[PDB]
């Protein structure tokens, strides 16, 4: 049920985007499967121009289906903006406008599924066309080219950051809002309560995606070492290409979402600090 697996992003104020997590993972999986299958042989490596153009075409089609939910999405932005710029009517309004966005996504599910299946059929056809001269000595050069091109730099980027310290910094910010809210004994209190509730949900999703990143970074690093500078039997090579495509897709989904949610958290934190300023300095 994709209704329970949708992330909501607000990277900048007045903006809203959604990610149906199972579709993001699925499209990314067949993207990695497509590149591994063509990079395997020099005679097929040149098909990257056509793969890049097909993936671009699939992304535009997916975004065209997402655009069908734009009026409902913009209606939800207007309510969030009203609830953040100072109540039960507004909180009721927010809950039913968010439910409407999830219903709109759910109403066009087969449209998304049709696009996901085009990507699967494309990735699977290339994967089925994978051939070895000797099915006992299948080279793994394609696994290395695809890892160097699409994965390696994301692993380095992750390892250069302290994602656990980022979580700790976010809990410190949330605790300071709780402290301010506790000792505040108004309409401003209701907006401080609503913004803090959004930030805590955003934080819980950041912590969820961060756990997946830390786990898949160790797994990708260990598994790449076992699947390169070696030959495999054809069936073993195919299974290890599906295994890596799965590992990469789970990692990339969480990495992309954690960054989008991190931006969403600090955009709401900047707005909350302005409310704290107007309430303390310009009001009481």
């Amino acid at each position, epitope marked *: 049920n994709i209704a329970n697996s949708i992330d909501i992003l607000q990277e900048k104020e007045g903006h809203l985007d959604f990610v149906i997590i199972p579709h993001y993972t699925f499209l990314d999986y067949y993207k990695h499967l497509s590149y591994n299958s063509i990079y395997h042989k*020099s005679s097929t*490596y040149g098909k990257y121009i056509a793969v890049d153009a097909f993936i671009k075409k699939i992304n535009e089609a997916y975004d065209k289906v997402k655009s069908k939910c734009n009026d409902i999405k913009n209606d939800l932005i207007a309510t969030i903006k009203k609830l953040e710029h100072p109540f039960k009517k507004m909180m009721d309004e927010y809950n039913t406008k968010k439910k409407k966005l999830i219903k709109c996504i759910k109403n066009h599910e087969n449209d998304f599924n049709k696009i996901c299946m085009d990507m699967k059929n494309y990735g699977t056809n290339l994967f089925e066309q994978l051939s*070895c*001269y*000797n099915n*006992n*000595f*299948c*080279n793994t*050069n394609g696994i*290395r*080219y695809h*890892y*160097d091109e699409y994965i*390696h730099k994301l692993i*380095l980027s992750v*390892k250069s950051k302290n994602l656990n310290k980022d979580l700790s910094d976010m809990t410190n910010i949330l605790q300071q809002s709780e402290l301010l809210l506790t000792n505040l004994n108004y309409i401003y209190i209701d907006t401080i309560k609503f913004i803090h509730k959004e930030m805590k949900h955003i934080f819980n999703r950041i912590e969820y995606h961060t756990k997946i990143i830390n786990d898949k970074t160790k797994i990708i690093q260990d598994k*790449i*070492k076992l699947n*390169i*500078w070696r*030959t495999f039997q054809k069936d073993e090579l195919l299974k290890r290409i599906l295994d890596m495509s799965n590992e990469y897709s789970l990692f990339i989904t969480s990495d992309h979402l954690r960054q989008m949610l991190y931006n969403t958290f600090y955009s709401k934190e900047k707005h909350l600090n302005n409310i704290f300023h107007h309430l303390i300095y310009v009001l009481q």
Partner: single-chain antibody
Amino acid sequence: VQLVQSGAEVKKPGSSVKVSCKASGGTFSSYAINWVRQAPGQGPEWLGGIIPILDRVNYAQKFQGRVTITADELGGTAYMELTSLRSEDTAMYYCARLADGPFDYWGQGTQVIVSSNIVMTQTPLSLSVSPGQPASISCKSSQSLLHSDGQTYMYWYLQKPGQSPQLLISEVSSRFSGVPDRFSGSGSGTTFTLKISRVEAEDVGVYYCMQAKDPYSFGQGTKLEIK
């Protein structure tokens, strides 16, 4: 990527020399870096290599004990330390990502002045032609270059004056990107041929065959000059 090596050296016999190789992008990702030297009167000679992601080193038997190859853990720098230097060690030393599909690139070379299983036989040693004349270079290996995977690991390099070697043909007959159609490769097993339908001034330099069936060994070279 581009590879940048440390500067020129003049060493006494019995001393050590350590050459560095930095990747422009900061990493060697999951690929290999190999060290190849070239003495004044000889063809290239492979010393050893490293796959930094695996921490796997491979050394040429004649250099085992004298060569140590290392890599920076997260710094994108490879090293080659040659100890107990002799006058025979005077050479241009190169680090390279050797003949890896569409990837072949070299460092600028490090001048060091001291003050194999598969043997490659190249023919002829020198070739003098006028522009437009065809040219042919042969290479014979002591063992077959055909691998159980169905690839024949035969390569052709051209080293132009004042330049690092450049890959022309991969796995017997595949022209590298940018290589004009006048260059062509043929052969199987142990006998291979590089042809130039018509020679042009820019073709001048030393051509070397390289085998990667038992990585790595090279031919002595074919110096091609105009008129």
